[PDB]
């Protein structure tokens, strides 16, 4: 579980007292990376790439590069292989709890059942019924975002409890008060519109927010609650990225099917090759941003509150 600290190390180092930073990234980052990347065909390609790097890790072989001046290969490749073949598990399990990826020409070839293809067991999600399923998973994603911010505020509160400059712990519980207040306000406006138990929630949130103000006249504290509000919302991109990738794969599959149905006596031979090369060329640029997004999300969202600023220890 230890070697995941490579990403944490070269920024997070700080002036001691902090406890949390290391175990959080292996339990979160590969999960959401896999949720983003639902293509099993891409996942097996990445597994083969890990196999390719395993052929170099056995020897010393720093292997250099002409362009990017990479030299620091020898032993960090081992832990990089460890993290990638840890995350391939999450992406392959996400690819099977998600919709199918390749070959499933559901018009004629239903590899796994559906109401449009009677027979074997139906698929759970297809992203044609996006009216309901997308709404539910969006609620799931924003729930994950808000609970992550909750855990961050909780650990900030725990730090404030031990350290006797606990005046900042008071503003820390003020953060949670503002969050529960705006949650009550959202449930009032675009929620189910009831206000029975919501009235107590808004009462307690607003009250504890004013008591947080009562600690001291912090001018910087009153605008930043808006930034905190956007922070839980920023997590929503994780569905849109994977939906874009899924629609890309689906439209490539439909194009291949259309080519292989009409000119099928010859269209299959060219179609398989063109589908493969198109998928690979799309992959080679889109996957960089795909993998860069969630680690940026985790950094800017989680570390920004407690451990980022202490001048690197």
């Amino acid at each position: 579980a230890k070697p995941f600290e490579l990403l944490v190390s070269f920024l997070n180092t700080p002036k001691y007292g902090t406890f949390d930073p290391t175990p959080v990234v292996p339990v979160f980052f590969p999960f959401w990376f896999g949720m983003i990347v639902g293509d099993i065909g891409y996942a097996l390609l990445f597994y083969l790439v890990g196999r390719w790097l395993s052929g170099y890790v056995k020897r010393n072989e720093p292997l250099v590069i002409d362009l990017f001046a990479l030299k620091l290969k020898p032993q960090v490749i081992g832990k990089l292989v460890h993290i990638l073949n840890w995350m391939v598990f999450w992406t392959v399990v996400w690819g099977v709890i998600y919709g199918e990826f390749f070959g499933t020409f559901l018009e004629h070839l239903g590899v796994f059942g559906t109401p449009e293809h009677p027979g074997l067991i139906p698929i759970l999600i297809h992203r044609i019924d996006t009216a309901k399923t997308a709404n539910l998973l969006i609620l799931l994603s924003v729930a994950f975002g808000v609970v992550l911010v909750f855990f961050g505020l909780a650990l900030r509160a725990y730090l404030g409890l031990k350290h006797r400059h606990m005046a900042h712990f008071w503003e820390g519980v003020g953060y949670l008060g503002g969050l529960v207040g705006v949650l009550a306000l959202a449930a009032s406006y675009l929620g189910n519109l009831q206000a029975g138990w919501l009235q107590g929630l808004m009462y307690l949130g607003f009250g504890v927010f004013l008591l947080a103000v009562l600690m001291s006249r912090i001018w910087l504290m009153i605008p930043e609650i808006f930034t905190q509000a956007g922070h839980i919302l920023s997590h929503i991109r994780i569905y849109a990225v994977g939906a874009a990738g899924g629609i890309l794969a689906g439209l490539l599959t439909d194009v291949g099917f259309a080519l292989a149905e009409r000119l099928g006596l010859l269209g299959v031979l060219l179609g398989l090759l063109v589908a493969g090369v198109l998928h690979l060329l799309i992959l080679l640029l889109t996957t960089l941003g795909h993998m860069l997004q969630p680690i940026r999300l985790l950094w800017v969202e989680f570390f920004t509150k407690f451990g980022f600023y202490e001048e690197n220890g």
């Binding site: 406006y189 808006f226 930034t227 956007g230 919302l233 920023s234 800017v300 600023y309």
Partner: protein
């Protein structure tokens, strides 16, 4: 009926697009100065990061109004 749906969709699209455009217009010059500052200001990359990530609240608020009127759908 369906005309109202299309019109409020136009409202959503205009709001989100123009909010994104304003945020990008800010971010372009902010990061253009910031990355040039990085080369010798290696210490100041933290301030550069927060300056660059600050103006995202604009598109946040645009998304907020889009989604509340999408609730009013």
């Amino acid at each position: 009926g369906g005309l109202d749906r299309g019109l409020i969709a136009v409202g959503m699209g205009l709001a989100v697009g123009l909010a994104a455009l304003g945020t990008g217009v800010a971010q372009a010059r902010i990061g253009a100065a910031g990355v040039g500052a990085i080369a010798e200001d290696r210490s100041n990359f933290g301030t550069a990061l927060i300056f660059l990530l600050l103006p995202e609240t604009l598109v946040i608020f645009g998304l907020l109004i889009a989604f509340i009127l999408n609730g009013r759908l």
